[PDB]
């Protein structure tokens, strides 16, 4: 099945993850869309922001 997800505006290639952030515009993003592999041993954030969004206003 072909469904768009990450801001990439393209379909889910295969390697993906879901935004583990209270917000995260979506809840499915591709690795080719973002940056990672099999997602770190634990949890990944839909996007470089999806994570920062979970931190909620942080100097980091």
């Amino acid at each position: 099945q072909e469904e768009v997800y990450c801001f990439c505006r393209n379909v889910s290639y295969g390697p993906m993850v879901a935004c583990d952030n209270p917000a995260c515009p979506f809840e499915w993003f591709h690795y080719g869309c973002v940056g990672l592999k099999q997602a770190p041993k634990g949890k990944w954030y839909c996007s470089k922001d999806c994570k920062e969004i979970a931190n909620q206003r942080s100097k980091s």
Binding site: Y13, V17, A18, Q38
Partner: peptide, 9 residues
């Protein structure tokens, strides 16, 4: 996080 993967080309 809920993930769905299939390796990368």
């Amino acid at each position: 996080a809920r993930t769905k993967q299939t390796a990368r080309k």
